[PDB]
Every structure is written in structure tokens, then in C-alpha cells.
Structure 1
């Protein structure tokens, strides 16, 4: 019927994916391999298309793939998977991919996901917070340029600050953190910014005499990034909720 012309059209579609800033086209051989005609109906082999989409997730999910990060003082390092991430919704994407392809028109799409942000751009762009646990230092990049840096004090060897791709999911003023050492603790703070799901975040360290060096080995926090009060205040003042925070 007029379906054969369609099958050829489809077979020649240029299906392009844009994932985490990466761009690529689905191989013609794959689409042709998925083509299907049964009971007068043109379609794609779901199983195979789903496998592809499954592979995409295995290959790009920032929920199971660490992020290569260009640090300020160490070149390119690896920041483990953190709380800021996304995961491709396999079935949803498979159905949307099938629909896109079967329509027989070239297209460029980013997969359906779930997480802090979508995959139609790099997970980490040019606005973020860099916490170099090695040089116990921290920078805040805004649109590519440094807007504020300072030494800080990570957690103590026993309760280390975890490395990972996190983000500021909340901003609080005059809050009191709680916890254990056994032995409950308080610690009131003027500015609080949680970055993970265990209690690790950024806040003024009113009681810390000095920051930087290897102070943490001696007087490390319980995991949060202790920051100089005046700096923390200026930081809290400009960091918008949703800002990625890389800790390595």
C-alpha cells in the first residue's frame, strides 16, 4: 500500500539523541533492524527498541554514571554519583522513541527522565559550587567566572564529608542541626544549605578559629562543609536553590 513508501521513509529517518550534552544519531542499520510489518501495520520491534533505550540508560544515567569534572586546582577528576542526577524512564522513552521514528521525520530529542534536571543539557554547566576536599578549599562559579572562594573545613576522618555530585536543595536561615558523636549534639547556624540526603551541607562555622590546611584531620565537622561566617553569609546570599555542588 502507501505503507511501503512509509517503511522506506522510516528506514531513512535521522533519529538524533541529545543526552547530557552529547549528540549522536541512531544507526540506520538499527532502525532497519527494528522495522516491522504485520497484519497491514507498520511498527517497530518494541523489545529491541526497549533494549536500546535500556542501553542508553546504562550508558548515560547520571544516577549510575559518575561525572568527569574540570576542577580549579587538579585538572580533570571524577566526582562520584551524588544526589543531583537523573534516570531515563525506559518504557516512556521507548514509546516516545517509537513514535518519533515511526513518524518518519528527522528529529533531535532528549530522553524522558526523572531527577534534579532534564538530560537536554550537561548535568554540570558553568554555575556551581566546587569543594576540593584535598585542598580543603571551596569556590562558587557563576556563569563561568569565580564569584567567591574560601578555605573551609570538611568532616573529621571518622565522619568524613562524602564525595559526590550534590546540589543545594534548600536554603535556611537560623537553623539548628542535630546529630551524634553516641552523644547528641546541636550547633545553631545562621545559614544552612543541605546538599545530600544524610545531613551533609554548607553552613557558617562560627566556632572555627581557622580554615583550610589539614584542620579537618584535627577538628573536622560531622560531614558538612564548615565555612567562614562572613563568607557563608555572602555565599548564601547569591547561591540559588538548585545549584550543583561538586565534592571530591
Structure 2
């Protein structure tokens, strides 16, 4: 029905296609959609090459796997936390087909895109719940639904083997575990509570062996990378922190 197909083309061009990605919300411009419209051998469709470009660019713009994260810190205002293990990436070919299908349906819509990674793009990467590790002030907070639920001085890694910055997360929890390391070569360390955040096996754990925790102590008594924590505190922390909670670690540019 050419009559019907042309009415289809009208509708399609007039669709309000809205994306919600990492918190930002926006509408795909009507001019971009009229561009993409096609009609060939009696079939209405969209120019895949062009739609795929658009979706590729969404990736370039928004992907938390390749774009750092602006973070409102506790002591320093808005800082930039670099990419880490807690991230996601838009799957270009899946999203391209999904977006075409949505648009050719010709009904107004909102979507967040198809991604692969630690969470989805339907919400901002960081929300009201997270662990903040301010490496400069050498101090750590656990925020839960907006409010600080616990805080403490810590000891980061020594300057030869420093704690890296990035948007990390608690990917596992383990009790009475025993960690392996290197110095001239092999060594060990038993720990009551262990929460890794990184793929090189950085993580947050208790320290019997650190007598005090604070400001300068890291320069001489620093760790191999991990975040040494008061044992009375670390227990109480492991108690309240769900697996999957993000951990933001940062120091001064």
C-alpha cells in the first residue's frame, strides 16, 4: 500500500526518539531522522550506515569504559576520577538494530542503550551509594542513600607501588582470606575481611600490623597498593557494604 507507506514515512520522521544515557536525557533531532529515512523496492527502512554512525558516536561521547567520571567529592568539590573497572560499553550492532526497530515503529519512545559491563546506562554510573577514597587526605567514606554511614583514615600504597585512581567497585567479598604478593620474590598476608576492587588485585582490607592510620604515613609505611583499614572499622564496613558498590579512588592533578 503505497498510500500507507507514505503515511508511515510521515509518522516515522515525526517520532520523538529520546535516549537516557548515564543520567543525561536527550531527543534525537528530526533532521537526523529525515536524513536516515529510506524507501527502496517498496520497503520503508533506515540507512544502517548512518544509524550505526550515530550509535558509534553515542559510544564515543558516553561510554564509561573510555570517558572519565566527574565526581562530587567530600573534601574537594567536583573532581575527575579516571576510568577503572566499573564501567560499561554500548554494543554498537545490537543498539543499531534496536534503534532502527524503535524508530520504524513510529511511536514516540525512550530508551537506554544496550551495553556490556558492570551495570547499565539507565542511570548515572555513580548515585547516592559508594565508597570514596580520598588519597590526598588519606581518608575513606561509605555513603549510603546520600548520608555518610561510616568513615575512617586509611593507608594507601607506598610511592614505589601506589594505589591507582579510578572508578572501581567491590566485585567480591571474602572472609578469613589470605593474600599473595612479591618483594625480592614470594610472600603472604592473612586478613579477616577482603573486598577487591580492581583486576590487578588491589582491594580494601583490615591491618593488624598498622598501628596508626593517616595523612603522611603512606610515604614510609605504605602498602603494596591495597587500602589498609582499621580492623574494628573494616569489620563494621564489610557488614554494611553490598557487593557491587562502587569505589572511587583519587588524588591531586
Q: Could you say whether these structures have the same fold, taking a TM-score greater than 0.5 normalized by the shorter chain as the test? A: yes
Shift of 1:182: 2.5
Shift of 1:206: 1.1
Shift of 1:183: 2.3
Deviates more, 1:216-225 or 1:176-185: 176-185
Residue segments in structure 2 that go unaligned for 5+ positions in a row: none
Task: State the SS of the aligned residue for 1:105.
Answer: coil
Cα offsets for 1:23-56 (capped at 9, x unmatched): 0000100000000000000000000000000000
Cα offsets for 1:140-180 (capped at 9, x unmatched): 00000000000000000011000000000000111111111
Displaced runs of 4+ in structure 1, greater than 3 A?
A: none
What is the alpha-carbon distance in structure 2 between the residues aligned to residue 82 and residue 149 of structure 1?
A: 23
Counterpart in 2 of 1:123? Answer: 125
What is the alpha-carbon distance in structure 2 between the residues aligned to residue 126 and residue 168 of structure 1?
A: 16
What is the alpha-carbon distance in structure 2 between the residues aligned to residue 57 and residue 2 of structure 1?
A: 35
Task: State the SS of the aligned residue for 1:178.
Answer: strand
Is 1:111 matched up with 2:126? Answer: no
Shift of 1:185: 1.6
Counterpart in 2 of 1:165? Answer: 167
What is the alpha-carbon distance in structure 1 between the residues aligned to residue 207 and residue 54 of structure 2?
A: 49
Cα offsets for 1:47-93 (capped at 9, x unmatched): 00000000000000000000000000000000000100000000000
What is the alpha-carbon distance in structure 1 between the residues aligned to residue 195 and residue 224 of structure 2?
A: 15
What is the alpha-carbon distance in structure 1 between the residues aligned to residue 94 and residue 201 of structure 2?
A: 33
What is the alpha-carbon distance in structure 2 between the residues aligned to residue 131 and residue 233 of structure 1?
A: 17
The 5 A counterparts of 1:150-229 are 150-229=152-231
What is the alpha-carbon distance in structure 2 between the residues aligned to residue 196 and residue 76 of structure 1?
A: 23
What is the alpha-carbon distance in structure 2 between the residues aligned to residue 212 and residue 12 of structure 1?
A: 60
Shift of 1:181: 1.9
| Root mean square deviation, CA, Å | 0.5
Task: State the SS of the aligned residue for 1:187.
Answer: strand
What is the alpha-carbon distance in structure 1 between the residues aligned to residue 86 and residue 196 of structure 2?
A: 12
Counterpart in 2 of 1:2? Answer: 4
Task: State the SS of the aligned residue for 1:191.
Answer: strand
What is the alpha-carbon distance in structure 2 between the residues aligned to residue 164 and residue 122 of structure 1?
A: 16
The 5 A counterparts of 1:93-108 are 93-108=95-110
Cα offsets for 1:179-199 (capped at 9, x unmatched): 112221211000000000001
What is the alpha-carbon distance in structure 1 between the residues aligned to residue 110 and residue 32 of structure 2?
A: 17
Task: State the SS of the aligned residue for 1:150.
Answer: strand
